[PDB]
């Protein structure tokens, strides 16, 4: 444990939709010497309900990163960039909020395996997409959002763990201290709140939408906001190939006081 006060600064969080885009172009913007972005996630992996059992399924793409690691994630830690498998519905009626004990406890440790066989630094949760229950599965929550974040820290207390404040995120404030950060889920527009109880410090209350941009004026008045108000975090939801150092440069001068550079490395989706 830390002595001292022990202040940390502004993080930026990027959603990478991996179905699109190479999660390399991540590293591609440098900010003080060091990459821009902090928390790449790669999105996403899925829960699946089959029968009984509680899955984390990976798409053909997803898995592709994986099994390519070396290729496709190792570059970006090597500059120090954490990189989070993203977690999201799949329509099967089963997610993150309606799972039985040894649901919980089975995709906990499908998670954790993953995160350690792959290298990861962690995941992030987006409670999207589950239709919950569709199929037999409880039409309701159970309680287990909050018990597969229990698990998780337990197994992976040196992991990171982020949260896309969609779905039943209300439940979490009891777990907070578990979770590192929370991502406002609507773009371009800040709300000044927090969910789940998250403090300032521990919150992305502007979350920049990088397909569909705002001005780079939009971006440094609203991040010089963001850092004055004391918040932890920005996101930064679909990141593409093309050059968007215009909007990071003004998060770069407002958040931050500096500027962010572009390193020229735009990388295809050669899978
Ligand atoms: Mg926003």
Same mark, same amino acid.
């Given at each position: 444990?830390?002595? $001292?006060? +022990?202040?940390?600064?502004?993080? &930026?969080?990027?959603? !990478?939709?991996? @179905?699109?885009?190479?999660?390399?172009?991540?590293?591609?913007?440098?900010?003080?010497?060091?990459?821009?972005?902090?928390?790449? !996630?790669?999105?996403?992996? @899925?829960?699946?309900?089959?029968? +009984?059992?509680?899955?984390?399924?990976? *798409?053909?793409?997803?898995?592709?990163?994986?099994?390519?690691?070396?290729?496709?994630?190792?570059?970006?830690?090597?500059?120090?960039?954490?990189?989070?498998?993203?977690?999201?519905?799949?329509?099967?009626?089963?997610?993150?909020?309606?799972?039985?004990?040894?649901?919980?406890?089975?995709?906990?440790?499908?998670?954790?395996?993953?995160? #350690?066989?792959?290298?990861?630094?962690?995941?992030?949760?987006?409670?999207?997409?589950?239709?919950?229950?569709?199929?037999?599965?409880?039409?309701?929550?159970?309680?287990?959002?909050? @018990?597969?974040?229990?698990?998780?820290?337990? /197994?992976?207390?040196?992991?990171?763990? $982020?949260?896309? @404040?969609?779905?039943? $995120?209300?439940?979490?404030?009891?777990? &907070?201290?578990? !979770?590192?950060?929370?991502?406002?889920?609507?773009?371009?527009?800040?709300?000044?709140?927090?969910?789940?109880?998250?403090?300032?410090?521990?919150?992305?209350?502007?979350?920049? *939408?990088?397909? +569909?941009?705002? #001005?780079?004026?939009?971006?440094?008045?609203?991040?010089?906001?963001?850092?004055?108000?004391?918040?932890?975090?920005?996101?930064?939801?679909?990141?593409?190939?093309?050059?968007?150092?215009?909007?990071?440069?003004?998060?770069?001068?407002?958040?931050? /006081?500096?500027?962010? $550079?572009?390193?020229?490395?735009?990388?295809? /989706?050669?899978?």
């Amino acid at each position: 444990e830390v002595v $001292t006060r +022990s202040a940390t600064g502004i993080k &930026n969080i990027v959603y !990478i939709e991996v @179905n699109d885009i190479n999660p390399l172009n991540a590293g591609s913007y440098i900010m003080d010497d060091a990459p821009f972005f902090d928390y790449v !996630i790669l999105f996403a992996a @899925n829960i699946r309900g089959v029968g +009984s059992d509680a899955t984390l399924y990976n *798409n053909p793409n997803v898995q592709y990163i994986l099994d390519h690691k070396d290729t496709l994630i190792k570059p970006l830690q090597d500059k120090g960039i954490k990189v989070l498998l993203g977690l999201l519905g799949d329509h099967t009626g089963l997610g993150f909020a309606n799972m039985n004990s040894a649901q919980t406890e089975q995709f906990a440790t499908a998670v954790a395996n993953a995160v #350690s066989q792959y290298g990861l630094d962690g995941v992030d949760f987006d409670d999207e997409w589950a239709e919950y229950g569709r199929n037999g599965y409880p039409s309701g929550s159970t309680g287990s959002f909050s @018990n597969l974040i229990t698990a998780l820290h337990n /197994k992976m207390p040196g992991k990171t763990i $982020t949260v896309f @404040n969609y779905g039943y $995120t209300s439940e979490l404030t009891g777990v &907070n201290s578990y !979770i590192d950060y929370g991502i406002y889920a609507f773009f371009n527009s800040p709300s000044w709140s927090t969910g789940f109880g998250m403090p300032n410090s521990k919150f992305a209350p502007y979350t920049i *939408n990088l397909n +569909s941009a705002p #001005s780079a004026a939009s971006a440094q008045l609203y991040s010089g906001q963001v850092a004055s108000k004391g918040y932890g975090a920005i996101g930064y939801y679909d990141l593409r190939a093309n050059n968007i150092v215009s909007v990071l440069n003004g998060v770069a001068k407002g958040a931050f /006081k500096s500027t962010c $550079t572009y390193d020229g490395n735009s990388y295809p /989706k050669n899978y």
